[PDB]
Automatic annotation (TrEMBL), chain A:
ATP 2 binds at N12, S13, N14, R70, E272, R276, R280, G343, T344. Pfam families: HSP70. It comes from Chaetomium thermophilum (strain DSM 1495 / CBS 144.50 / IMI 039719) (Thermochaetoides thermophila). The keyword RNA-binding does not apply. GO terms for molecular function: ATP binding; ATP-dependent protein folding chaperone. It comes from the Eukaryota. ATP 3 binds at N12, S13, N14, G204, S205, R206, E272, K275, S279, G343, T344. This is Putative heat shock protein. Keywords: ATP-binding, Nucleotide-binding, Stress response. GO terms for cellular component: cytosol; nucleus.
UniProtKB/TrEMBL annotation, chain B:
It is found in: Cytoplasm. This is Putative ribosome associated protein.
Amino acid sequence: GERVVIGITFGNSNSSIAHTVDDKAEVIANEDGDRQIPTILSYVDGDEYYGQQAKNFLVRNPKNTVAYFRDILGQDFKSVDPTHNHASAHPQEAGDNVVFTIKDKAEEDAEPSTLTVSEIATRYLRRLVGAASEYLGKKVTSAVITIPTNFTEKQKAALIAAAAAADLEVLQLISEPAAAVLAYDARPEATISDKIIVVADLGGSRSDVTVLASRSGMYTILATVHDYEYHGIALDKVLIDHFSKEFLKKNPGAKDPRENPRSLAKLRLEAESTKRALSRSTNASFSVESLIDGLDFASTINRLRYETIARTVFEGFNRLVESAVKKAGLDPLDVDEVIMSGGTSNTPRIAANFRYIFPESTRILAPSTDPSALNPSELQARGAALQASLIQEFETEDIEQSTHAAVTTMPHVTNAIGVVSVSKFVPIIAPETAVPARRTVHGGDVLVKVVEGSTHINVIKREKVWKIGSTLAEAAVRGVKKGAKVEVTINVNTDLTVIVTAREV
Amino acid sequence: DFKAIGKLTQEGSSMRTLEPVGPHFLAHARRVRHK
Ligand SMILES: Nc1ncnc2c1ncn2[C@@H]1O[C@H](COP(=O)(O)OP(=O)(O)OP(=O)(O)O)[C@@H](O)[C@H]1O
Ligand SMILES: [Mg+2]
């Protein structure tokens, strides 16, 4: 009856599995040693390969290999962009459903199997959980799966169906940004508080920026921005082009290795592998064995040059964050933390650019800009692992009805409210806080005056200011004199009621 | 003690939606099911 639980992140490029240890969340590695497991499935001589092993067969076996299929579940055939599947097995239409033609049977004369994108997802998930099963020594019954914000319930149900078809119990579907925040706030070092967070999920085939409002340790999502143009694949191209131009100059007369599928497939793998080294080291090698015309290619590149050739894309990321913060009706001054997530967020330069974009107050969480930062790839799986860990005791009717009714109903105050202290305005309950909540902080009598507050920006350069709104209630306690501190607590209610209590020393 | 009851401006709160993750939501979800 009871369950084994994991957190499972499911991406177009990579997927991860993570379990819960009573103290802390642990990412599970597969039998290949990969914590970041490629979302790839391939068949050679009837044997199924997934993850890294399937990723390698994109060279000698492109047509029997399926990759970049997550954004294809529950998708109408025209809505998908088969740009990324051109290297591998191409998607095909089966009326409403998307299908792939691949030789998964051992016998040579056997016809290629036409498999639904759902069945593809089903076979991969089976292996994915199984790798966690082997590590844990126990069959895994349940998990929580991370999802993007903008995909429809058609995709969500499709994911649940394929997971059901993989005999895996999905507890809840949580969002990829919220998982990242949870992955930080649940740690002991973190201190829950009210602050506006922006999560920049830089991926392979996509990049998602999401702005949240963390109040009372609970997350409410203010704006979302998606972009399918600035991502790791673009960066991979920056390296592919850079190194391809170098190959022709050194080996005149040879075919351009981009013009041969097998040679280009080798370039893509190696360009990525060098890119990853450039995130850890200031110098990285790039090489391909018998790239084209039977010629080995060998070269190097230092980080500074890479940042130069990749400058164009990096600035694209900056405009994503600025657009998202703008989409929330905010300024970079309003941002407290930026949680860097996704595989491309290991790039050191991206963090450096974000530091310049934001004030010195704003926290930038990446291994290169904060001693407390976490591995950007692991965040979502940790988030999923934690969420899965907490839910495992509850039942499915509890999760389903609590999801829609309780999450929608709560309204949020549009203005901050605080006590005014002139001889200025101090916030007590930050704006956009969900009701109901409670907050309190610390030569004559003390006079507490509760007012509404908003944030404005004044060009004089710019800085955050508070304009005082309407007064709610006024209060004075008469005999404390010289004492230094004043504790004031105030409780907002579901009926928009405001309750101040006085007993400050 | 001195305690006053004030009313927020009717337009001070707009309807928004939350993220059903984390212990603080799940702990608050208990209060909503009860009422
Ligand atoms: N250490 C690293 N340095 C730089 N880039 C990296 C690093 N690790 C992974 N990447 C890149 O990040 C991308 C993968 O990120 P991630 O695994 O989060 O993507 P995904 O969510 O699986 O894919 P998508 O978001 O496109 O569906 C790939 O382009 C990969 O090359
Ligand atoms: Mg992702």
